[PDB]
Amino acid sequence: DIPDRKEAVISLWPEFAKAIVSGKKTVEFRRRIPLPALSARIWIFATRPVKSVIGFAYLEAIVQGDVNTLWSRYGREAFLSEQQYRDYFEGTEKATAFLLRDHQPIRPINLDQLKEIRANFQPPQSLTWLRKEETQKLVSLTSQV
């Protein structure tokens, strides 16, 4: 359940979301964010115009470091451009990197479907923990692409 932090949802722009579930993007950079447990399943919500859960991946490592060293070490796996990285971290010296593995694309679970699982679902700005029952219903709708 939620205290275990094994099931979470994050939101990504469509080109980055699709890059995670295809395995091209294996690092996700964040500022301050609740940290999941290791081996947590991270469901990928793709924002407008897709507005759907389109896959998931598993968290294999959490890195916390300084902005410039993380770009050097992990920027190529993170898919975004250097300008987009500097924009996002403008105003802090600290960065967090999620290292992901075992990406799995699924048939999109659209917004109305997610609203049956969670009445007031909104795309998380950072990360939202899934309740046991919420994870159950989500798994019940997972199908191959």
Author numbering: 3 to 147
Quoted passage from the original study:
In the ethanologenic bacterium Zymomonas mobilis ZM4, the gene ZMO0922 encodes a 148 amino acid polypeptide, which has been annotated as a putative ASCH domain-containing protein (ZmASCH) that belongs to family 23. The weak nuclease activity of ZmASCH depended on magnesium ions and the protein appeared to prefer the consecutive pyrimidine-adenine dinucleotides for its cleavage activity.
Thr49, Arg50, Lys53, and Gln127 directly interact with atoms of the phosphate backbone, while Tyr47 forms an interaction with the phosphate moiety between the −1 and +1 nucleotides through the intervening water molecules. However, removal of the side-chain hydroxyl group in Tyr47 (Y47F) substantially decreased the DNA- and RNA-binding activity of the protein. In addition, this Y47F mutant also possessed decreased RNA-hydrolytic activity. Mutations of the two independent residues at the positions of 47 and 128 did not make a noticeable structural change.
